[PDB]
Design a binder for these strands. Structure first.
Ligand SMILES: [Cl-]
Ligand SMILES: [Cl-]
Ligand SMILES: [Cl-]
Ligand SMILES: [Cl-]
Ligand SMILES: [Cl-]
Ligand SMILES: [Cl-]
Ligand SMILES: [K+]
Ligand SMILES: [K+]
Ligand SMILES: [Mg+2]
Ligand SMILES: [Mg+2]
Ligand SMILES: [Mg+2]
Ligand SMILES: [Mg+2]
Ligand SMILES: [Mg+2]
Ligand SMILES: [Mg+2]
Ligand SMILES: [Mg+2]
Ligand SMILES: [Mg+2]
Ligand SMILES: [Mg+2]
Ligand SMILES: [Mg+2]
Ligand SMILES: [Mg+2]
Ligand SMILES: [Mg+2]
Ligand SMILES: [Mg+2]
Ligand SMILES: [Mg+2]
Ligand SMILES: [Mg+2]
Ligand SMILES: [Mg+2]
Ligand SMILES: [Mg+2]
Ligand SMILES: [Mg+2]
Ligand SMILES: [Mg+2]
Ligand SMILES: [Mg+2]
Ligand SMILES: [Mg+2]
Ligand SMILES: [Mg+2]
Ligand SMILES: [Mg+2]
Ligand SMILES: [Mg+2]
Ligand code: NA
Ligand code: NA
Ligand code: NA
Ligand code: NA
Ligand code: NA
Ligand code: NA
Ligand code: NA
Ligand code: NA
Ligand code: NA
Ligand code: NA
Ligand code: NA
Ligand code: NA
Ligand code: NA
Ligand code: NA
Ligand code: NA
Ligand code: NA
Ligand code: NA
Ligand code: NA
Ligand code: NA
Ligand code: NA
Ligand code: NA
Ligand SMILES: [Sr+2]
Ligand SMILES: [Sr+2]
Ligand SMILES: [Sr+2]
Ligand SMILES: [Sr+2]
Ligand SMILES: [Sr+2]
Ligand SMILES: [Sr+2]
Ligand SMILES: [Sr+2]
Ligand SMILES: [Sr+2]
Ligand SMILES: [Sr+2]
Ligand SMILES: [Sr+2]
Ligand SMILES: [Sr+2]
Ligand SMILES: [Sr+2]
Ligand SMILES: [Sr+2]
Ligand SMILES: [Sr+2]
Ligand SMILES: [Sr+2]
Ligand SMILES: [Sr+2]
Ligand SMILES: [Sr+2]
Ligand SMILES: [Sr+2]
Ligand SMILES: [Sr+2]
Ligand SMILES: [Sr+2]
Ligand SMILES: [Sr+2]
Ligand SMILES: [Sr+2]
Ligand SMILES: [Sr+2]
Ligand SMILES: [Sr+2]
Ligand SMILES: [Sr+2]
Ligand SMILES: [Sr+2]
Lengths: 154, 95, 186, 92, 160
RNA sequence: ACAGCUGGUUCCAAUCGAAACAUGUCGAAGCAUGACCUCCGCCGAGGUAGUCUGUGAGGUAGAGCGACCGAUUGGUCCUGUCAAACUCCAAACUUACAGACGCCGUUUGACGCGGGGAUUCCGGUGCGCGGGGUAAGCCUGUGUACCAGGAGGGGAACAACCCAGAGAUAGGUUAAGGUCCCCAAGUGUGGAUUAAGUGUAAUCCUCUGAAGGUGG
RNA sequence: UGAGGCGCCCAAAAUGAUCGGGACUCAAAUCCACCACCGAGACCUGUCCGUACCACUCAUACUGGUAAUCGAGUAGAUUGG
RNA sequence: GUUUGACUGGGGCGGUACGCGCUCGAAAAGAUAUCGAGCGCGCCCUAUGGCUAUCUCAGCCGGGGACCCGGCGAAGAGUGCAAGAGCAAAAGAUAGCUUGACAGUGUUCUUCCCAACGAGGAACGCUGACGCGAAAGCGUGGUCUAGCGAACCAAUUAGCCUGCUUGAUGCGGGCAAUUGAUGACAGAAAAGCUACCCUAGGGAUAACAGAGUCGUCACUCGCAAGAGCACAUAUCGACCGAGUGGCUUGCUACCUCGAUGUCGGUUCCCUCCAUCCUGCCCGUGCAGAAGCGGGCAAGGGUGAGGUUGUUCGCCUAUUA
RNA sequence: UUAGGCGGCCACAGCGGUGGGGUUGCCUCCCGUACCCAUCCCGAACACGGAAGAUAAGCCCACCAGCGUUCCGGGGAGUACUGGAGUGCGCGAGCCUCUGGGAAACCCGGUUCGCCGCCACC
RNA sequence: CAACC
């Protein structure tokens, strides 16, 4: 399970690339989504590789972001252990985080918006003109790298 | 194109690879297809008659009946539906 | 054989056994084919149908298994050919086959020949086969008369092994008589 | 090109094949009593006469065959599409 | 005509003689110099002139560079010195010139050139250890008459 | 008088939002019919902008030609080269159909169908691939995103280069870009090179700097 | 003797020189790394408005609800004032 | 009284990219432009059409560039004509027979990718009548893609409908289709001049100038063959290669057609340096004098006259 | 399939080569022209009639790789080329990095001297 | 060289 975060806006990006993001439920910059590691999804991320940041987050990181940015399918209702327990097949965020990472369920399946609307990165990111290997923030990240990003955008 | 006849620009698609040159095996020219069957359209360079417009080479249509010994195959050229008259020699079952 | 671009004929073409152009025309009928063939000593009739991995023979008769019903004469002549067709035909009717097209392979359409005799046989057996009467040898020749008279110019028996001296087309009758009969084990 | 004066072909009248004799269509003479003839007289006056002031058009480099096919038994003829032929000579 | 006009590979390959007529003759007098009756294997030293950039070299340039190179080898080793040099490229690309403004501009045929990829050997010489510096000098003079910078690369030669 | 040509055509807002192309035209400064925009009505459950897989189509890049074809070296088998109108080979990739996942539709009715109303048929720029041309802020194609009709931030200024698509108002954090002063943020840290004010200039009509040379 | 880095020569134009300017030389240049910051209407967040849809309703009047998946626009189509 | 067309790196002249076909351009589905590259069609054929039987071709070798025999020979032959493609017990050749190059009426595709549009075309059916073959089957012309033409009118083919109260005769009107042409080829019947000119507009489109380009032009640099009695480099300097300028020319059509006055000269001002003189140098094939070549250098100077509107240039006497 | 007939795929099947196989069996070569039929002349072929002989052809069986072909390993090669991205480099033609794909020639070693279907048959 | 050729 990889966490996808759009870091480059729609202006001037190929339409087929933009439609791909939208199919992955991301419609804004800084919006994040969780995607199972399938051959079908793999092609999709590979196609949007140059306008996003992705990788597998740690259980703790996913838990922090879910607590801070997870949202119901509808409404402003907070998403905390109590919400999780009273609405999902889990007892708290951890149970959810684990099930997501192990790809046993999806945010939608548990009445949650497929999208995590993150905040701009605290202290800024590494730049959207270069990939990770070159010092930029685009493309596949390390679990520690993706965690650094996701946490700075908690 | 410099001209607009039916065979304009069909050098490659209507030419046989040297080894497939010569009269083609009768089996596929006699093959029977059923209505609803998916068939790939591909002209056989060695077979003169029963062809469709070269522009349609590569389509995968649906048999919906026949006219004489030829087949009526439905396709969608871009956004438009068309019926193609084509003999078995230029067809192949899908899958 | 010469190089990458060299064109080798289809196997049955190299072997000079299959006339593919005639075959195609034959298959366009949608009907089974009455494959008539010959050997120096024998005559064979097969009812073939088209199949996924090759042709399918639904019925057939060889001149050899003709003796299996009381035939002691040679098996490479007109009487033999006709009867062999009829036998194959009868068996064809047994398996549900009702019509066919004469496939004479690489043989010549000579009037009165054996492949045409095989056809007359298969037709009398009840099989519907597109044909032309005035291309079939006259009755007597089918019986084997032409050979009887040839034995008339004796001085030395036509047949080495003793089947008879003046030969017998009347035997042809007995056999056809036996085949058109119901009982007969096909 | 050469053309056989007579030959066997379909007669749409007998409704069966029969020998026909082929002939080039000879122009029939006008009567000067058709409606167009009267319109010409009625509409031509002082000055230009519109369509009646136009003169004969041109010619195609080659004309199409213009033949009659006469049935050898019922004696009736039928017409057919023609084909461009620089020249058409009959044989016999 | 300046080479700036044709030194770049900015046009389709134009070499089909069956569709091109009036092609001027090549000015290249020889492609094999020195003792061509002898094999390149009979020499201990092999030095090539390598082109550093991809370019088109007009036949007029090949002749001059080849000429000024072989000429030096002849002066320093003699009209029959023990060596052999080769110009391995031939001017297959036909050149045009549009010499009526931009109307019907397709140019008339005016020459030929050889396309050389960067890193390729334009010339290759074979000599004895003695005449090694003479060939390196013949090449220094040759690359001064062709568009690109060149490398004078010494292949078989561990006599340093 | 007529014009297919120039000019002008007066209040507010809300929803959607082009075409600068194809066919015909005494047609190219115009029309009609399509494409595309929009409005209304009918239909009633699928749809397919993305990806994966399966069954097909293809001969461009590259490569190669003791595989055709035609070019193109030398020596007494060897040795030297090529192709827009070559191919024994052969991609990436584009594309038909289907299944799966995704997204979407069944009160927001999708897909499809019928009808009303158009505007439009001078386009331009960047990038990729081109063809012509010495070249051009050149001419003429193609795919795409942009300007046109696109604010706001950056780029000295600067239609289409970068960030960015934007209801009002407010707090906050970033993007591109920048942190010596002008001007918000470093005269930041570890280290090295440069002595020419090289340089302090992503892209570019716009920022030059070459072959050749250098015991700096 | 081979290779790499930066620089030098090659290097001439017309009203007043220029990296935007000042001006800068263990840099305020270049290259390799790193640290902390500044900086949009983007993104996050409070309230409100419009629009679409939903519940209730005679209502297109109120009240409540949903919008991560609504909010730029020339020619033009549609509708309320 | 009118017409005298359109395209076009402005218009005219030239050409036809004005209707068709093929290869390439074209970027491996389809589609795709230029006054893009190569090149064709406006027919021809009664067989050079159709079927059946028999049969296998170029080319080379061996035996008696004609003939006969054998061998190798998947195709290089032949198949009417461009190109590309198809074809070997054939789609080629020979022989024989034959007239399907037939009548009626459709389906579909194409023309016109997508996506509406006529004529024309093709593939594929049904019906009728036929040809050949044992038969399956083949034949809706020539293996495939060019060889084509609206309405009105006329002639023609077979049958029928119809013409003003009514009957007869004449002569008309019509249903279906064939032939006759519009090549500006989705169809007008059609020549020029205008400097005597006029109007509408266009910087949608030229001329001057500007701007871009720099082939052309000017200048420079690299390499240095060659000659300079010997001697590359005192000096002259081919080829080839690399550049700078924006003085010439060409190209483009970006700016301006509700106007930015057009060559030459003159007058008056500023500037550039690639320097003609003047200052200071280096080399010499530098004795001197003087030449020749080179370097720094733009402070100052660079004038008067003859022809020509001339710019330029040619010429004269002066001049540092 | 102790030898046959009709095929499908259409060289992995071609080219060339070695070895083995048949008394009333099979296929042939083979013997022979009264008939059906036949040769622009030849019973050569086609056609018919038939068994004295033969396994020398063909054919079938076993096998060899020199040529041609198919697929595979290792090397060439993650090279050549390339879809997406970049305020990366270069005076420039052009190149590079990241991401996703990925050849061809050729060399060396293997594979390949058909596979399969129906029918008939000591 | 200032238009038409
Ligand atoms: Cl079609
Ligand atoms: Cl047989
Ligand atoms: Cl006529
Ligand atoms: Cl927007
Ligand atoms: Cl300074
Ligand atoms: Cl209002
Ligand atoms: K003007
Ligand atoms: K004038
Ligand atoms: Mg919500
Ligand atoms: Mg940054
Ligand atoms: Mg091609
Ligand atoms: Mg308004
Ligand atoms: Mg409103
Ligand atoms: Mg290539
Ligand atoms: Mg506009
Ligand atoms: Mg400050
Ligand atoms: Mg500077
Ligand atoms: Mg900040
Ligand atoms: Mg008038
Ligand atoms: Mg004009
Ligand atoms: Mg294409
Ligand atoms: Mg008329
Ligand atoms: Mg007529
Ligand atoms: Mg027209
Ligand atoms: Mg047209
Ligand atoms: Mg006026
Ligand atoms: Mg203009
Ligand atoms: Mg004025
Ligand atoms: Mg100077
Ligand atoms: Mg001065
Ligand atoms: Mg043997
Ligand atoms: Mg640059
Ligand atoms: Na074939
Ligand atoms: Na009148
Ligand atoms: Na001209
Ligand atoms: Na008027
Ligand atoms: Na336009
Ligand atoms: Na027009
Ligand atoms: Na107009
Ligand atoms: Na679906
Ligand atoms: Na390429
Ligand atoms: Na836009
Ligand atoms: Na600004
Ligand atoms: Na400076
Ligand atoms: Na509007
Ligand atoms: Na006219
Ligand atoms: Na039509
Ligand atoms: Na100029
Ligand atoms: Na220049
Ligand atoms: Na003046
Ligand atoms: Na001065
Ligand atoms: Na004078
Ligand atoms: Na044998
Ligand atoms: Sr009158
Ligand atoms: Sr008159
Ligand atoms: Sr004419
Ligand atoms: Sr070019
Ligand atoms: Sr050089
Ligand atoms: Sr909108
Ligand atoms: Sr393409
Ligand atoms: Sr500092
Ligand atoms: Sr430092
Ligand atoms: Sr400018
Ligand atoms: Sr630059
Ligand atoms: Sr340099
Ligand atoms: Sr709004
Ligand atoms: Sr709006
Ligand atoms: Sr006039
Ligand atoms: Sr002009
Ligand atoms: Sr045909
Ligand atoms: Sr005149
Ligand atoms: Sr006058
Ligand atoms: Sr003005
Ligand atoms: Sr100076
Ligand atoms: Sr002086
Ligand atoms: Sr003069
Ligand atoms: Sr014999
Ligand atoms: Sr340059
Ligand atoms: Sr791979």
């Amino acid at each position: 399970m990889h966490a996808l975060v759009q870091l480059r806006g729609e202006v001037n990006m190929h339409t087929d690339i933009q439609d791909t993001l939208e199919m992955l439920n991301i419609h804004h910059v800084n919006h994040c989504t969780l995607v199972p590691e399938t051959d079908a999804y793999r092609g999709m991320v590979a196609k949007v590789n140059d306008f996003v940041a992705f990788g597998e987050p740690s259980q703790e990181t996913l838990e922090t972001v879910l607590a801070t940015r997870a949202e119901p399918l509808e409404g402003d209702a907070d998403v905390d252990d109590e919400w999780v327990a009273e609405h999902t097949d889990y007892d708290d965020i951890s149970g959810l985080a684990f099930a997501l990472l192990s790809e046993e369920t999806t945010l939608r399946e548990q009445g949650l918006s497929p999208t995590l609307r993150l905040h701009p990165p605290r202290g800024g990111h590494d730049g959207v003109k270069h990939p990770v290997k070159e010092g930029g923030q685009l493309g596949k990240h390390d679990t520690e790298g993706i965690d650094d990003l996701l946490e700075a955008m908690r | 194109p410099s001209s607009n006849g039916p065979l304009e620009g069909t050098r490659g698609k209507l030419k046989n690879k040297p080894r497939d040159r010569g009269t083609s095996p009768p089996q596929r020219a006699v093959e029977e297809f059923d209505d609803g069957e998916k068939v790939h359209l591909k002209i056989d360079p060695s077979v003169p008659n029963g062809r469709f417009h070269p522009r349609f080479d590569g389509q995968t249509g649906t048999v919906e009946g026949k006219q004489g010994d030829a087949y009526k195959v439905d396709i969608v050229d871009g956004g438009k539906e068309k019926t193609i008259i084509v003999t078995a020699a230029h067809l192949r079952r899908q899958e | 054989a010469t190089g990458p671009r060299y064109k080798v004929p289809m196997r049955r073409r190299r072997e000079a056994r299959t006339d593919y152009h005639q075959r195609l025309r034959l298959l366009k009928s949608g009907k089974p084919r009455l494959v008539a063939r010959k050997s120096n000593k024998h005559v064979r009739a097969q009812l073939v149908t088209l199949g996924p991995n090759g042709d399918d023979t639904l019925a057939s008769a060889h001149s050899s298994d003709l003796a299996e019903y009381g035939w002691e004469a040679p098996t490479g002549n007109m009487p033999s050919a006709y009867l062999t067709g009829l036998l194959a035909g009868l068996r064809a009717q047994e398996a549900g086959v009702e019509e066919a097209v004469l496939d004479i392979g690489l043989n010549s359409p000579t009037p009165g020949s054996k492949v045409f005799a095989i056809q007359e046989g298969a037709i009398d057996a009840g099989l519907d086969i597109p044909h032309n009467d005035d291309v079939l040898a006259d009755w007597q020749r089918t019986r084997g008369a032409h050979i009887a008279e040839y034995d008339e110019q004796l001085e030395e028996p036509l047949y080495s092994g003793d089947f008879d001296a003046a030969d017998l087309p009347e035997h042809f009758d007995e056999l056809r008589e036996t085949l058109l009969d119901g009982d007969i084990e096909l | 090109m050469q053309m056989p004066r007579r030959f066997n072909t379909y007669c749409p009248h007998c409704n069966e094949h029969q020998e026909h004799e082929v002939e080039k269509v000879r122009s029939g003479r006008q009567t000067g009593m058709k409606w167009i003839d009267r319109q010409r007289e009625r509409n031509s006056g002082i000055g230009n006469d519109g369509k009646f002031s136009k003169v004969p058009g041109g010619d195609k480099p080659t004309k199409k065959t213009d033949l009659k096919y006469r049935c050898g038994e019922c004696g009736k003829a039928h017409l057919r599409e023609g084909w461009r032929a620089g020249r058409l000579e009959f044989q016999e | 005509k300046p080479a700036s006009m044709y030194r770049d590979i900015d046009k389709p390959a134009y070499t089909r003689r069956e569709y091109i007529t009036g092609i001027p003759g090549s000015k290249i007098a020889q492609h094999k110099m020195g003792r061509k009756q002898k094999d390149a294997d009979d020499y201990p030293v092999q030095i090539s002139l390598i082109v550093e950039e991809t370019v088109q070299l007009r036949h007029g340039s090949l002749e001059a560079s080849r000429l000024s190179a072989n000429r030096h080898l002849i002066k320093e080793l003699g009209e029959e010195g023990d060596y052999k040099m080769t110009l391995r490229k031939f001017p297959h690309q036909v050149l045009r010139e549009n010499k009526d403004g931009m109307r019907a501009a397709f140019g008339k045929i005016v020459g030929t050139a050889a396309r050389v990829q960067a890193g390729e050997q334009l010339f290759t010489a074979y000599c004895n250890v003695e005449d090694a510096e003479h060939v390196k000098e013949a090449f220094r003079r040759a690359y001064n008459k062709i568009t690109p910078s060149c490398r004078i690369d010494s292949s078989p030669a561990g006599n340093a």
